[PDB]
Amino acid sequence: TGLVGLAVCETPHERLKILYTKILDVLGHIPKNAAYRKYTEQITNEKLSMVKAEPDVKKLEERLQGGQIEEVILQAENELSLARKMIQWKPWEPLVEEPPASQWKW
Amino acid sequence: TYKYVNLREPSMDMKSVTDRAAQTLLWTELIRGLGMTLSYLFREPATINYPFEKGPLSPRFRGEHALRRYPSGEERCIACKLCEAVCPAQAITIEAEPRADGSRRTTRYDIDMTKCIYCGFCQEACPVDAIVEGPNFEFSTETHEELLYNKEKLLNNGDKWEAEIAANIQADYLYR
Amino acid sequence: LIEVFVDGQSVMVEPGTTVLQACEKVGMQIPRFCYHERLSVAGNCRMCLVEIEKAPKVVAACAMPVMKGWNILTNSEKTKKAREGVMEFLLANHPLDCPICDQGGECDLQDQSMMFGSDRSRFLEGKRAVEDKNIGPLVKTIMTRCIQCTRCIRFASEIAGVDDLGTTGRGNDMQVGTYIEKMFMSELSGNIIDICPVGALTXXXXXXXXXXXXXXXXXXXXXXXXXXXXXXXX
Amino acid sequence: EYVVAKLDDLINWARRSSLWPMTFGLACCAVEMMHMAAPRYDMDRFGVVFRASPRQSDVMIVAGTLTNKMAPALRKVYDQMPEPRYVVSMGSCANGGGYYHYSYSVVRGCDRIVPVDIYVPGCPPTAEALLYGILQLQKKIKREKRL
Amino acid sequence: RPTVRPRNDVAHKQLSAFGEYVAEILPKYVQQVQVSCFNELEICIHPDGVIPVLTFLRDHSNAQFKSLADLTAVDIPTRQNRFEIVYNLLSLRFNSRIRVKTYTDELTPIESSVPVYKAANWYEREIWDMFGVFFANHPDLRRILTDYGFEGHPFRKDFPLSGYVELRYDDEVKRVVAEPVELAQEFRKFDLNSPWEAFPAYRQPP
Amino acid sequence: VKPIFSRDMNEAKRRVRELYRAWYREVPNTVHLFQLDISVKQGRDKVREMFKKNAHITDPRVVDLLVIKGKMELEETIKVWKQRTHVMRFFHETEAPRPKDFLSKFYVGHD
Amino acid sequence: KNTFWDVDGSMVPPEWHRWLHCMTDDPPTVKPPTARKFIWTNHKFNLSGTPQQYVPYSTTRKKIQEWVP
Amino acid sequence: XXXXXXXXXXXXXXXXXXXXXXXXXXXXXXXXXXXXXXXXXXXXXXXXXXXXXXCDGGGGALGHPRVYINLDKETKTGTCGYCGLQFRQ
């Protein structure tokens, strides 16, 4: 069995569990008062509970993905890169940038 | 919906491997591909030689422009600048003056064939049905000057096609 | 000055200000046929009908003033049902000249059907036609295209000086003409063609020469006659 | 005297027999130019051969729209052509910019780049009308080199 | 209504949740204005950070967009800030369309979208061609739709439709194709604009 | 500061100097590789008249954009691109060309 | 034209939209051509590069200017 | 009617001492047959019974929008906007 995409369908469990536990710590380094940490954490914790309850079932892969484990692993792989870029460039924690000129209607 | 293009290993063991190898060792499928054109050669070709035979058409077809007139003389074009503004190429130009006394119907009326992308929009926008698109193919010139249509005149010379236009418009009122 | 809210937004207006004059301050133009700039305030069409917050009958914008602090809506449910209806009454006895007609895009009645009036259908059968009225040099007048209003009638009486235009009948036969066969005087009566909303009175010298569509406009002061400024030339 | 007049027509008959056009795929017109290959309306081996080639071809059909980027590109093709060359401006874009025209990029007329002998007015130039362009070309060749 | 209405609003409140969710982060660096109309979402972004907005929506646990496919730009001379580069984004896993806009005048350089999206570099060349907006830290900024000997930027509303260099003669010189000739046929400027306001509620008070 | 562009005031002037050397070396190279056209000496005179029209310098923002454009229209020769003596030619060949005088232009009658 | 060896689609009177391609009924058998005394009685061939062909023409009388002693 | 060589059609001037016209020399210039609107006056006027009459070309098939013409004056017969057809009584 193999996925349709170029990413190889490898039989690996707990691989999703490592990456989802890693990203939670990165979020709790610099932003704390920001809403970015407060909202993303509760989605990841909801997804981690489904992995712990269901043992290698296709129904667990069907939850919020429905394209096997290979597509879900790609969602976790770029999550660490997105969290590190959000930690490096301050945007979520700080808001002080100038407002636009008053015009919008065409 | 899913249909799948991949065969997923047609050969398995012994019998299924040999015939998949036979088509690559010699040819077989190339000889089978040769037979496709072989029967295609015998069946009669659908070919039309233009100076004698003519191709299929329709009751409504757009070609070279020609403006129609009433059965009892009189130019049907009323001069509105209606067809001028709708024209997406801006090929049609119209400047109007009063005709002698009373009547007010046109003076300048040029349709560029250097422009004009052929819509039938000017046929549709016309309330009096002046420009009606006739079944035309024959138009070939030496210059742009000979190609672009002058102040009516050559458009009025569409009388040779107006007999067909009158027949075609009878299939146009209450559309098809 | 008393303030009264129109379409929820509040606008300050004078005590003797008209309803349509108050609407201009809120940046909204009601459908018009009888002028508000210089010509005298008169009814005789009932197009500019607007419904108040608590009123059984709609009042005309030209006649009725605001006076007290009352709410009036321009985009109301009753107003849109009115505006579509009155347009149908105007066009039940209209000669159909639009492609031949001297105006086309410049015509105020032509725009109001597109903007306000009912589009899908118009119930009508058999329209009456009026005989052509006598006119001298300027404005080739056609009585059929006329909607029979009071705009040019008051123009000759007040703005021009010499009165000629009036009423001739009673029903759908009353003409805006002079009734007696006489040519219109010059003075300043050449501007009467520009006043009329319909394509009834339009300059005979530049008739059917160019439509309102495809004409580049430019403003320039006139050389002939002193104290003349701002005149658009196509 | 009589042989001189008759031999001239024999050379003109050689071009009346066969004409090899250039396959320029620079248009929607080019899809109608592919309808010349489509069996229902054919000049294929009646005169037209779809082999084309930049040097061996006698005719070049300028198919539709030409931009200022293709203006030096189509000019050098015309120089590679042999002396008996005929240029057909098939399509309204080729005649003088059917659409666009007043646009910045599209070249008006084609004659500003390459001179045209036969004009075909049609946007979607119907294969029926396209058959005239080749038949008129064959008819236009009447007399060449008297002295 | 049967033929008058296209579709009734039902997903409008569902799409309005996105108008709150991204705004719940609340950056002055990113958010500014959120507009939602006709089953579609529109966001405009402060010039200082465009790349951090594009790294967002890419991946993400709540919404997975990935494809930052189609890229447009708006030319408008009404505002003090001229150009408006508009990103059209599409999701495959989520099935939704969101919009990313820029408000800056951008005659001065703007941050590139090449490190986030691969096909973005080809669209970025078009914006430099037609509009004349330079992208900072861009790999290979080359002319595509413009001519090789073309002056200015072909789309800008400041200059005419015909242009300055457009007509190309051959005439006297044996090989050199002409350029300096400027004259073209007269494009008829239509002054067709209807009296009376077209629609209510769209009217703005002076 | 805002906005960055590339250089600040004095640094922008030396970017033009680096651009001038790169284009000065290409005009002898674009005779044998391209075509003879006019002259090597006359081609170098075309460079000086181009920079005279651009010579104003009030803000580094305007200068920096000219460098990027200068590394494009003058780059249309270095990496070998098709022009066929039609593109990248700046000088008018068929120019009349008109003069600015109240006796020369008024005799022809224009505007 | 006086040609038998070479002939284009310049020939054939008003019948192109009839039995030639579009309509089912034949022009002299079932469906008759309508008379209006406006259409040309004799059919004309293509213009081509030959004399008596198509031409462009001016329309307006222009702005008048006159000077007399 | 024709002036010198070229024939006038729908009110058109040829050339003032041959200056503008030069292209129409080898090739013959076009001319519309009966463009003087002689066929407009050739059609006989129809008698009317009502005060106002509706005009039509030939129903909805032929392009003619409906216009009502008034008949009140005895002198000069009234004609519709689209047709040159006149009505009396």
Ligand SMILES: NC(=O)c1ccc[n+]([C@@H]2O[C@H](COP(=O)([O-])OP(=O)(O)OC[C@H]3O[C@@H](n4cnc5c(N)ncnc54)[C@H](OP(=O)(O)O)[C@@H]3O)[C@@H](O)[C@H]2O)c1
């Ligand atoms: N560099 C030089 O050679 C030089 C030096 C000093 C001055 N010039 C002057 O510049 C001019 C150069 O012209 P050119 O020699 O380049 O012209 P050319 O090539 O001889 O071309 C003249 C054309 O006119 C036609 N033609 C001329 N007389 C004709 C006749 N009696 N009957 C029929 N056709 C006729 C010919 O057509 P057919 O071939 O079909 O008959 C020929 O194609 C000369 O007139 C000369 O006075 C030249």
Ligand code: SF4
């Ligand atoms: S062709 Fe029709 S729409 Fe155009 S000016 Fe003539 S009558 Fe009016």
Ligand code: SF4
């Ligand atoms: S067919 Fe289209 S482009 Fe041609 S004249 Fe009519 S409206 Fe214009």
Ligand code: SF4
């Ligand atoms: S008055 Fe106005 S609406 Fe009536 S026919 Fe004339 S242009 Fe059309």
Ligand code: SF4
């Ligand atoms: S001519 Fe015009 S202004 Fe006078 S009454 Fe009639 S519609 Fe009103």
Ligand code: SF4
């Ligand atoms: S003439 Fe029409 S079909 Fe041909 S290239 Fe132009 S737009 Fe396309």
Ligand code: FES
């Ligand atoms: S517009 Fe107000 S009464 Fe006529």
Ligand SMILES: [Zn+2]
């Ligand atoms: Zn009629």
